[PDB]
């Protein structure tokens, strides 16, 4: 043994199970709500089902320049109208 | 001298749960980025403004389809750091520019690095020879030539594999259709190695089951070993006559038998490494000039090499305009090879 | 990109009149077409016979024109040839033979809208696509 | 008898903490329509 | 806690069911259990189809392995394989449900409250392994039983409302058998044919007359062999071949059972006689031909002579010949050519397909079965997308012909492992060796070296 | 002692430097037919109409072939799954022209290897053995059985099994992939797990037991002398690998009981390969690999293509372009 305590120990006793019955469905949710509240899609740049295309364009936003690269998202990004 | 540095040596090889030791300074935020860095991107971030794809459960794809996806090819080999000039600190930009494909290839590596001192860092504490780390170099080797070596010698990281089970088997389905993998004799000894690898894993552990003493009284065999125990625990002379007559040949040296299950799958993956160096460059076993020549002149020759060359051509023009959109290619359909009828 | 009630305006007769559909509509004509229809049309070719697509350039040459809601209404009732000169009921799905075409017996006249309307709104979505074939897979 | 914080112990979290997250976030991404 | 633990019984608990090999009585109720968990899963599965089934789509089109099973015995089907009373279906599946709460009673109670073996309280159910009389005796038992269910299809089909028959004359119907084959000349004459290509062994079997025939001697032959082990003990070849074991019995019926379903796998494959088409789907072979059929027919109509019609090979494009003559449908079908089909048949001659049959006779029933069978050939996903693994979504398919026979053949793999795993066990527990080797009597070391 | 009993004590002799048994009996003549033509096949024979399509296919090395290109070529679509021995050809040029050959090495190779796993069965019982290290061969021997046979039946001629050689071999491998999308099935990829699996446990077994080798030499010496053959103590230090493993990933983790080690180095690539033949032979009746084509839609109802739309691009070249004269009609439905 190297001397912490036993998991079996740890995760039959009733102290472990009342706080993990508040923490880990609280994280449950807030991983819920990240997406509920669209917060995802803005923190990581990620369309909706409704803004990979213009109403009417069927070519893809796709990145050509290395270092005008963030103004060409920028760009594509306006043209959605 | 019992200074700083050897408390802090102290404290790193403490023997708990987790060993750290001072290869885990290395080892572990990088193995943990490049782990959370794929969950991250394989849960939320798109291939749309890279790849004209969708990559991540937030659209829709399943664990078989969801990937991080490879940068843009217009990034050429660009480290893509986070505060560099194409995303400029802007963590979403960087993103969707694919940084987060050098996130995980950079810190992979150097976590890969960090295992592998881990392996030399126990076993001299330990006391026993460090040929598990010697082993470990081979997939350290494949990595490096495969998610390093081959996109350097191409024109951009776009080429490289992405991180995902889908994204990899259409490398898989390049390599064929452009390299002629299959035909290259690099690869056929990796595949030697990894199949005979295989091989020697089932059948050394299907003899010793099988070649067991009874040392114990249960019709469950397992109880009936002990790690300090000092007889073999099966027997080495049965297993040897056994074989020698089911197949001609047999192991006589345990050993020797222990080095050649080292040997066999390390070489193996080492031989595949070289010749994806040789990708790198497109320096490719494609043809056998000999075949070409007489089927050129003669249109009744009819080999297995001609009918695969075939398969490549259809898969080089039915996937290219989708899977390399940035150069544009325009197939009318008049101009893409098929057969009758299909 | 949305369905917007431009996409799901579609030409209800040759004279120009035309009728714009809602949202469930259309989604009834997919699964409507799926049901009785994409076992051979999927796509918008024809596996049995693939000269005849549902393209709605193929369909406003068709006799009489099937390019708009009572055309291929008409169609699902008494299907033709393309040149109008036969009536094909005998080999070809439609209510006049729904006894020898079962799945054709539980669609009504409301159903037959929703699944002309899916064939008119979807190349307008799908483009090329639709009636292409594997080559726009 | 037993220590409660240890390096095991922050090991088990940075694992487990963002795993029960991310299993929330892709549990409602199933109710996501186009 | 009789033998409930590894070290009373020798057995560690992921091999727990061998504890049971000695105790009869116990393994009497895990054997009814089980048998209730069977019956069981065929009253529930029947019900839930019938819930999910729409009369008016095909069966095949709707996901259904156990109603295409009782509407091919001729229940709630009428001409052409339409579905006229759907009630039978609900018969069937209500009373093996409720039969499974018999079984799964008389399980429960043998295996946990009635007695743990079965040798004290009466002779006539207990049993010793190594008895080879009372062994042959149950044995004998289990085969009048076999012998009187194969008669219940032979009553089925001669009194009691016939069968379905796909080659009935008219689109198929529900008929009765009224003279089953009893020729042994034609029933054991399908036992001697080959396995191989136009032959195809017992899964060749294309009409009722011979389904039934056969059924009348397997029904005969069961009871009397079950009559004659009731009445003898093994003799002597044949005790010195064997070993006398549980073990080994089980090894014996795992054999037995992955053999018969690698059988089962190409039955439904191949045959469209008891797995009808109407029911299960087109074949492989079927719908390959319904695609040369239906482009056939649609050039033809269009003006083509498909009789002289050259192809880019120099095979003709619609017609060709086999390797013995036979007049054929081209293409990469020429590997179906021994496909036969009531849809097919009246366009075939002395010689095969008849071009002048082809010319004239064509009827649009034959049409739209040719259509109906291309486009559900039994290719599609793991998913259910029908169709071959380019295809896009779409269409919800996979036919009930390739759920059979991959889950079959599968299975039969594994029972062919088990049969290896427990033969090759029965032997050497028999012998004295399972568990190891001794070491002060190890066979190798009293053996001269090989060299 | 007579001839009857000496005949089944020589052939069921331990002491034969090769063992024969019941087994063997069938196992030696089938073999050594199948090795035979394979050789001569290989070397001389002449091309073979494997599509039917009268456009024979050269295989043999006199015939322009080299060891990586040629092969025996499989039998004629023609023919099916039609049973075709020397005796049903007019004459040997025709058995030839339509791939006789093919059939004969694969009956005889499957009969001889089904015996070649009764025999290590056969001669685990004359020795004392447990029993179980022809489950183990079971594994190879159902995927030579999956290629060779179950796929033939299923899509129902001998043309679509494997052919004899190695070009041949990738072949067959493109084309399963246009046809079924095996890359996208679980039993495929559980074969992956298997055999990427068990090459690595292979190294790591290897790796462990070397790095543990109690020290019996000097440094000139190869440290394999210090195992001597039959020798009755361990030649490695168990608990020391174990301390070392236990000590790279956590302690349990790593296995101390050497039994339980070595039926898991047994069960993991077995159990794989198993999976990879189940692949082969259920692929055999057409249930394919999961399809995700055009899975992903958009608000408007735009195709969003994900990797599976690229791998589909890839397997439509593959498709349209395989065996490209023998197509008449728009499905390749076998
Ligand atoms: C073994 C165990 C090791 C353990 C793992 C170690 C992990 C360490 C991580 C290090 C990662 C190195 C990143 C290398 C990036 C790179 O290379 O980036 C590439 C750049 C060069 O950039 C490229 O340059 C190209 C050529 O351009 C030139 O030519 C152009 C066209 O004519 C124009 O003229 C242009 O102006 C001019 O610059 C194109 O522009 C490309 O788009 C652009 O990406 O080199 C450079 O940064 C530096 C180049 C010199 C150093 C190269 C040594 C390292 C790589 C060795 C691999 C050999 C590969 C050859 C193929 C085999
Ligand atoms: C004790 C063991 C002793 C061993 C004995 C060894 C002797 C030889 C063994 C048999 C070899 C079989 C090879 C050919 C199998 C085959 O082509 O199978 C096909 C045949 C069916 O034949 C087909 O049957 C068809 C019959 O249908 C006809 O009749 C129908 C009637 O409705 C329809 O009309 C249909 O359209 C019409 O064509 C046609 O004749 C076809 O041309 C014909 O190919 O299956 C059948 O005979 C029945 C199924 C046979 C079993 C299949 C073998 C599977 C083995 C798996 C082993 C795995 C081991 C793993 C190791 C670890
Ligand atoms: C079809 C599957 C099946 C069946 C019929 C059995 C049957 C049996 N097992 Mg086996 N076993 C199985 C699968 C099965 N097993 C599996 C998957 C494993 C691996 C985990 C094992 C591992 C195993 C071990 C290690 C042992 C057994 C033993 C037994 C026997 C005694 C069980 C007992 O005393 O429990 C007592 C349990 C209870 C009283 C709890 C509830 C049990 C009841 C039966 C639940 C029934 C619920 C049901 C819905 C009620 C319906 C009532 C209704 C019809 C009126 C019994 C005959 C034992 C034995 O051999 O004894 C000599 C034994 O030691 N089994
Ligand atoms: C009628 C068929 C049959 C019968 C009555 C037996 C009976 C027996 N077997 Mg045998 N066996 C069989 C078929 C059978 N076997 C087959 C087909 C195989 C090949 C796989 C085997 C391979 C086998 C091995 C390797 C061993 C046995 C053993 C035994 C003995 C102990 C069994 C036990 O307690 O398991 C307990 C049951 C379990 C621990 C559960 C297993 C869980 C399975 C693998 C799950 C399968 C997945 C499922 C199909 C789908 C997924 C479900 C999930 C999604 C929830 C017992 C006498 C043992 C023995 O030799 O004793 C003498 C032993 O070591 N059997
Ligand atoms: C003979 C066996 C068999 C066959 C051929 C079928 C066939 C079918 N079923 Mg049925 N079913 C079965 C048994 C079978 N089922 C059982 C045992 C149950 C109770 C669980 C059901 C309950 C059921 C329901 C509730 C439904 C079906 C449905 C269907 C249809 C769609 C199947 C599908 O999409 O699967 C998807 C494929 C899989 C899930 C693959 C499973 C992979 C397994 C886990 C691998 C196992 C391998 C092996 C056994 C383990 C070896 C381990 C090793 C260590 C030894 C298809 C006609 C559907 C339908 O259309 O109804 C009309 C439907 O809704 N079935
Ligand atoms: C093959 C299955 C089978 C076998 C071999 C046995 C054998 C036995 N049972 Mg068990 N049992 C079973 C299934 C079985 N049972 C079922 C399904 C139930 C729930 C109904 C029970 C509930 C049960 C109880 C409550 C008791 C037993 C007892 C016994 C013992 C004495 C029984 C006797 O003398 O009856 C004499 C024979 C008859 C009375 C003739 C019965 C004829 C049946 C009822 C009509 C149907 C016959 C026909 C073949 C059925 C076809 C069914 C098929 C379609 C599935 C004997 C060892 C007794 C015991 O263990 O004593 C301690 C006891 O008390 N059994
Ligand atoms: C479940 C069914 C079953 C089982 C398990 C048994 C089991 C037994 N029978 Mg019984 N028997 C049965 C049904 C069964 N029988 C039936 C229905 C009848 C009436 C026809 C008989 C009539 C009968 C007689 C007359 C005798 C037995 C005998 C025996 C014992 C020796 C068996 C043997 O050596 O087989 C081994 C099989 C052979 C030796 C056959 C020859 C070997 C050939 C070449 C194998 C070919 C295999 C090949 C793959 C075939 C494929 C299919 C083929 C048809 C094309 C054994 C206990 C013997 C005995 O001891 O009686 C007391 C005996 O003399 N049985
Ligand atoms: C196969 C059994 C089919 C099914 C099911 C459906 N259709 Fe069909 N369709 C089929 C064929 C062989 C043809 C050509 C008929 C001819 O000889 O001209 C068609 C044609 C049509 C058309 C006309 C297309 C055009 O003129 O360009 C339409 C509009 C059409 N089919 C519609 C349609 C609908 C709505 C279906 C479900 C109710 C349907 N078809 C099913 C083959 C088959
Ligand atoms: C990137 C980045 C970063 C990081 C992040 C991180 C670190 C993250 C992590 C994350 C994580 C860490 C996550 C996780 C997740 C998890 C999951 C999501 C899981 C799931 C699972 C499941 C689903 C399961 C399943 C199964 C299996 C597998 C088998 C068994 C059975 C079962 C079925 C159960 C930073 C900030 C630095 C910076 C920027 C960039
Ligand atoms: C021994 C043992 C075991 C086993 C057991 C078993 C296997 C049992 C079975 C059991 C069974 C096998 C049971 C059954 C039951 C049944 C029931 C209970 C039923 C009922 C029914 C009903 C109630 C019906 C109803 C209805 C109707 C009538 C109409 C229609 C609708 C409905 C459905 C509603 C185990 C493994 C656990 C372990 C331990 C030992
Ligand atoms: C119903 C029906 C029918 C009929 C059928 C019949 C009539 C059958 C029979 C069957 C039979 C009649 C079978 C048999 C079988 C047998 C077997 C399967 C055998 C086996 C054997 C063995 C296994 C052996 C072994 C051995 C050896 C070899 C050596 C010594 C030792 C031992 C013993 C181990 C028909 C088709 C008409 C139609 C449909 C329906
Ligand atoms: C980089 C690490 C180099 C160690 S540096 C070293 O550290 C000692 C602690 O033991 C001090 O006592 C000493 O003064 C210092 O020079
Ligand atoms: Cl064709």
Redesign the pocket.
């Given at each position: 043994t190297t001397g912490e305590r036993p998991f079996s120990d740890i995760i039959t006793s009733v102290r472990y199970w009342v706080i993990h019955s508040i923490t880990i469905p609280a994280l449950f949710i807030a991983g819920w709500l990240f997406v509920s509240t669209g917060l995802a899609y803005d923190v990581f740049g990620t369309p909706r089902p409704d803004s990979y295309y213009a109403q009417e364009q069927r070519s893809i936003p796709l990145v050509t320049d290395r270092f005008e690269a963030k103004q060409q998202v920028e760009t594509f990004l306006e043209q959605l109208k | 001298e019992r200074g700083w540095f050897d408390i802090l040596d102290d404290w790193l090889k403490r023997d708990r749960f987790v060993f750290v030791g001072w290869s885990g300074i290395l080892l572990f935020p990088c193995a943990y980025l490049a782990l959370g860095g794929w969950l991250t991107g394989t849960t939320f971030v798109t291939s749309w403004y890279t790849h004209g794809l969708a990559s991540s459960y937030l659209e829709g794809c399943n664990f078989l389809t969801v990937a991080v996806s490879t940068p843009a090819n217009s990034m050429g080999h660009s480290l893509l750091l986070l505060w560099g000039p194409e995303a400029q600190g802007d963590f979403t930009r960087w993103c969707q520019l694919g940084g987060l494909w050098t996130f995980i290839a950079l810190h992979g590596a150097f976590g890969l690095i960090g295992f592998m001192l881990r392996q030399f860092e126990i076993a001299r504490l330990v006391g026993v020879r460090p040929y598990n780390a010697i082993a470990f170099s081979a997939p350290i080797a494949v990595f490096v030539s495969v998610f390093l070596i081959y996109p350097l010698g191409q024109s951009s990281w776009f080429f490289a594999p992405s991180f995902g089970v889908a994204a990899i088997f259409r490398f898989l389905l390049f390599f064929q259709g452009f390299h002629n993998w299959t035909l290259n004799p690099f690869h056929m000894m990796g595949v030697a190695g990894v199949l005979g690898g295989a091989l020697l894993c089932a059948i050394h552990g299907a003899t010793v089951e099988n070649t067991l003493f009874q040392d114990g009284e249960g019709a469950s065999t397992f109880r009936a070993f002990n790690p300090t125990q000092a007889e073999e625990t099966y027997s080495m002379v049965t297993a040897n006559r056994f074989w020698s007559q089911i197949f001609g040949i047999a192991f006589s040296n345990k050993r020797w038998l222990h080095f050649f299950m080292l040997f066999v799958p390390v070489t193996g993956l080492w031989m595949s490494a070289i010749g994806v160096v040789g990708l790198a460059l497109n320096l490719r076993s494609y043809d056998f000039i000999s075949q070409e020549i007489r089927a050129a002149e003669d249109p009744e020759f009819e080999t297995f090499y001609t009918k695969n060359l075939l398969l490549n051509e259809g898969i080089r023009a039915w996937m290219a305009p989708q899977d390399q959109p940035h150069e544009n290619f325009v197939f009318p359909e008049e101009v893409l090879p098929r057969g009758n009828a299909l | 990109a949305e369905l917007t009630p431009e996409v799901l305006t579609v030409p209800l007769n040759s004279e120009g009149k035309t009728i714009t559909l809602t949202e469930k509509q259309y989604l009834e004509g997919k699964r409507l077409f799926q049901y009785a229809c994409a076992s051979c049309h999927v796509g918008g070719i024809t596996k049995t016979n693939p000269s005849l697509d549902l393209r709605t350039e193929t369909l406003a040459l068709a006799t009489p024109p099937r390019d708009n809601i009572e055309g291929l209404v008409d169609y699902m009732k008494n299907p033709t040839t393309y040149d109008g000169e036969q009536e094909i009921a005998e080999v070809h799905p439609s209510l006049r033979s729904a006894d020898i075409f079962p799945k054709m017996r539980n669609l009504t006249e409301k159903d037959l809208v929703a699944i002309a309307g899916h064939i008119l709104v979807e190349p307008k979505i799908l483009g090329d696509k639709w009636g292409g074939g594997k080559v726009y897979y | 008898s037993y220590p409660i914080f240890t390096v095991r112990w922050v090991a088990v979290h940075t694992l487990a903490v963002p795993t029960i997250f991310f299993l929330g976030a892709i549990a409602a991404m199933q109710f996501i329509q186009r | 806690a009789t033998n409930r633990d590894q070290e009373s019984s020798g057995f560690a608990w992921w091999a727990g069911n061998a504890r049971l090999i000695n105790l009869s009585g116990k393994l009497l109720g895990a054997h009814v259990a089980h048998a209730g968990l069977i019956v069981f899963?065929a009253g529930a599965?029947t019900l839930?189809?019938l819930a999910?089934f729409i009369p008016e789509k095909p069966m095949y089109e709707?996901?259904?392995?156990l109603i295409p099973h009782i509407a091919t015995l001729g229940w709630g089907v009428g001409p052409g394989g339409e579905v006229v009373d759907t009630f039978p279906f609900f018969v069937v599946g209500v009373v093996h449900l409720i039969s499974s709460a018999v079984l799964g009673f008389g399980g429960v109670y043998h295996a946990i409250r009635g007695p743990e073996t079965l040798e004290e309280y009466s002779s006539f159910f207990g049993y010793d392994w190594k008895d080879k009389n009372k062994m042959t005796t149950i044995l004998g038992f289990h085969l009048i039983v076999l012998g009187i269910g194969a008669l219940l299809l032979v009553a089925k089909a001669m009194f009691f409302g016939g069968l379905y028959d796909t080659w009935a004359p008219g689109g198929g119907d529900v008929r009765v058998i009224t003279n089953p084959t009893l020729d042994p000349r034609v029933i054991f004459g399908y036992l001697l044919k080959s396995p191989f290509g136009g032959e195809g062994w017992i899964v060749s079997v294309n009409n009722l007359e011979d389904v039934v025939g056969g059924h009348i001697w397997i029904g005969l032959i069961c009871i009397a062999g079950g009559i004659w082990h009731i009445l003898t003990t093994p003799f002597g070849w044949a005790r010195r071949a064997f070993i006398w074991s549980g073990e080994a019995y089980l090894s014996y019926s795992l054999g037995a059972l992955s053999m018969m379903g690698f059988i089962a796998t190409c039955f439904v494959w191949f045959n469209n006689t008891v797995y009808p088409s109407e029911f299960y789907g087109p074949t492989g072979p079927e719908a390959s031909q319904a695609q040369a059929m239906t482009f056939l027919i649609r050039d033809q109509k269009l003006g083509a002579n498909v009789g002289s019609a050259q192809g880019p090979t120099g095979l003709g494009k619609y017609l060709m010949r086999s390797p013995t003559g036979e007049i054929i449908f081209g293409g990469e079908t020429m590997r179906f050519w021994d496909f036969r089909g009531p849809w097919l048949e009246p366009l075939r001659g002395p010689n095969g397909l008849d071009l002048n049959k082809i010319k004239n006779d064509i009827q649009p029933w034959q049409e739209r079965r040719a259509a109906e069978y291309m486009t559900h050939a039994p290719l599609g996903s793991?998913n259910?997308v029908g169709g071959v693994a380019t295809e896009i979504n779409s269409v919800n398919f996979?036919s009930?012909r390739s759920?059979?026979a991959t889950?079959?053949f599968?299975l039969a793999f594994?029972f062919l492992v088990g049969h290896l795993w427990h033969a090759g066990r029965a032997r050497a527990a028999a012998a004295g060796f399972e568990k190891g080797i001794d070491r002060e009597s190890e066979p190798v070391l009293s053996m001269p070296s090989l060299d | 002692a007579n001839l009857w009993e000496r005949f089944c004590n020589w052939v069921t002799s331990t002491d034969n430097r090769l063992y024969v048994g019941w087994f063997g009996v069938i196992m030696i003549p089938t073999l050594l037919a199948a090795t035979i033509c394979f050789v001569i096949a290989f070397i001389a024979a002449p091309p073979v109409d494997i599509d039917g399509i009268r456009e024979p296919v050269s295989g043999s090395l006199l015939y322009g072939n080299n060891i990586i290109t040629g092969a025996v070529v499989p039998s004629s679509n023609a023919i099916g799954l039609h049973f075709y021995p020397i005796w049903e050809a007019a004459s040997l040029d025709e058995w030839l022209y339509n791939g006789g050959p093919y059939q004969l090495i694969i009956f005889h190779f499957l009969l001889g290897a089904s015996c070649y796993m009764g025999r290590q069965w056969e001669l685990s019982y004359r020795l004392g053995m447990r029993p179980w290290i022809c489950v183990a061969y079971s594994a190879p021997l159902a995927s030579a059985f999956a290629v060779f046979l179950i796929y033939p039946i299923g899509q129902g001629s001998f043309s679509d099994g494997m052919p004899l050689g190695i070009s041949g071999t990738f072949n067959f491998m493109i084309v399963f992939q246009a046809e079924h999308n095996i890359l996208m099935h679980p039993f495929h990829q559980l074969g992956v797990a298997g055999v990427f699996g068990g090459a690595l446990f292979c190294a790591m077994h290897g790796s462990l037991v070397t790095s543990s080798l109690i020290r019996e030499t000097t440094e000139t010496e190869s440290a394999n002398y210090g195992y001597k053959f039959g020798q009755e103590e361990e030649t490695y230090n168990i608990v020391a690998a174990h301390g070392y493993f236990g000590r790279l990933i956590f302690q349990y983790a790593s296995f101390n009981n050497s039994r339980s080690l070595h039926f898991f180095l047994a069960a993991w690539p077995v159990?794989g390969v198993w999976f990879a033949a189940l692949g082969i032979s259920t692929m055999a009746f057409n249930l394919n690999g999961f399809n995700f084509n055009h899975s992903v839609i958009d608000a408007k109802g735009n195709v969003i293509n994900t990797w599976a739309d690229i791998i589909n691009r890839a397997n439509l070249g593959m498709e349209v372009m395989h065996e490209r004269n023998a197509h008449n009609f728009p499905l390749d439905l076998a």
């Open positions: - | - | - | - | 899963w599965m839930f189809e999910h709707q996901g259904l392995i793991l259910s996979v009930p759920w059979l889950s079959h599968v594994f | 159990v």
